[PDB]
């Protein structure tokens, strides 16, 4: 059968998002050589991550209810924020370092290698440390990542279709609140924590904007490339 997004319980939402999670990818460099472009390695990894991101987005409840056109718009707006939140998530347990891959752990000083890269590393590190200080949970993380996908390009857009995106966002909010209530936080505590997490999302937006400026100054997937990737997914084996 098929669940409609708006009928999911909190536990079914959590379960669907956990099940949709992409794998952790490794960097493609020979462990026999030192002698590699940092830019090259990060570009190669991001590219492989994007393929998995397409498969993931298709599994975010509500996403496939939208038109192909609207799906591509959302991904085009959100793809860097999504790569960034995943990065800061897995870097939480590594104070002062970014875990790009289990075989690609980088500090501040290594970031200085590429020009304009150091401001962005620092902002990512601050996000990772804020998430560690808040003890961000995996269940919360998957909800935040889905919120990024559905909200990033909603205002830069068929009005009844917008209510649907807004109703799916309300469902994800409900799911976050339910996780926090089960964790034993009080009402005010539930609200304060929700606020804190949503406010971090504006910082993630900021980082993505700065990231995009930096990428465009030199790689960036266009509406057309994302459309092509979303469409090609239909030809993948089950």
* Binding-site entries for 17beta-estradiol: 49, 90, 214
Residues in contact with ligand H09, counted by CB under 6 A, come to a total of 21
* Listed residue (212, 175, 205) closest to 14, CA to CA: 175
d(CA 170, CA 166): 6
Strands 104-107 and 97-101 turn out to be antiparallel
* Site for ligand H09 contains 221 (CB under 6 A): yes
In the complex with ligand H09, the residue whose CB is nearer, 22 or 194, is 22
Q: How far, in whole angstroms, is CA 4 from its chain's centroid?
A: 23
Q: Is 126 exposed, middle or buried (0-12, 13-18, 19+ CB in 10 A)?
A: middle
Binding mask 103-122 for ligand H09 (x = CB under 6 A): -----------------x--
* Site for ligand H09 contains 147 (CB under 6 A): no
> Which range in 60-68, 150-158, 176-184, 219-227 contacts ligand H09 by CB under 6 A?
219-227
> Which range in 15-23, 46-54, 65-73, 189-197 contacts ligand H09 by CB under 6 A?
46-54
Largest CA distance in the chain: 56
d(CA 40, CA 48): 13
* Listed residue (189, 197, 208) closest to 172, CA to CA: 197
In the complex with ligand H09, the residue whose CB is nearer, 49 or 139, is 49
Instruction: Indicate which single residue of 8, 53, 72, 84 sits in contact with ligand H09 (rule: CB under 6 A).
Output: 84
Q: How far is the CB of 79 from ligand H09 (least distance, A)?
A: 8
Instruction: Indicate which single residue of 10, 13, 17, 46 sits in contact with ligand H09 (rule: CB under 6 A).
Output: 46
How many CB atoms neighbour CB 181 within 10 A?
14
**Cα torsion angle, 226, 202, 41, 52, sign:** negative
* Site for ligand H09 contains 211 (CB under 6 A): yes
d(CA 24, CA 130): 22
* Site for ligand H09 contains 214 (CB under 6 A): yes
How many CB atoms neighbour CB 4 within 10 A?
9
Q: How far is the CB of 100 from ligand H09 (least distance, A)?
A: 5
Q: How far is the CB of 42 from ligand H09 (least distance, A)?
A: 3
Instruction: Indicate which single residue of 15, 28, 29, 39 sits in contact with ligand H09 (rule: CB under 6 A).
Output: 39
By CB under 6 A, name the binding residues for ligand H09.
Answer: 39, 42-43, 45-47, 49-50, 83-84, 86-87, 100, 120, 211, 214-215, 219-221, 225
């Amino acid at each position: 059968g098929s669940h409609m997004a708006l009928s999911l319980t909190a536990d079914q939402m959590v379960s669907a998002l956990l099940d949709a999670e992409p794998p952790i990818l490794y960097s493609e460099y020979d462990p026999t050589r030192p002698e590699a472009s940092m830019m090259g390695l990060l570009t190669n990894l991001a590219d492989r991550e994007l393929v998995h991101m397409i498969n993931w987005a298709k599994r975010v409840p509500g996403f496939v209810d939208l038109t192909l056109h609207d799906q591509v718009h959302l991904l085009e707006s959100a793809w860097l924020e999504i790569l960034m939140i995943g990065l800061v998530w897995r870097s939480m347990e590594h104070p002062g370092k970014l875990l790009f891959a289990p075989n690609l752990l980088l500090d501040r000083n290594q970031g200085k290698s590429v020009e304009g890269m150091v401001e962005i590393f620092d902002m990512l590190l601050a996000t990772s440390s804020r998430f560690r200080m808040m003890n961000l949970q995996g269940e919360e993380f998957v909800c935040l990542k889905s919120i990024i996908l559905l909200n990033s390009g909603v205002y830069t857009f068929s009005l009844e279709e917008k209510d649907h995106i807004h109703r799916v966002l309300d469902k994800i909010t409900d799911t976050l609140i339910h996780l926090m209530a089960k964790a034993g936080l009080t009402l005010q505590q539930q609200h304060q924590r929700l606020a804190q997490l949503l406010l971090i999302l504006s910082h993630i937006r900021h980082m993505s904007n700065k990231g995009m400026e930096h990428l465009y100054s030199m790689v960036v997937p266009s509406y057309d490339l994302l459309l092509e990737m979303l469409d090609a997914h239909r030809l993948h084996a089950p």
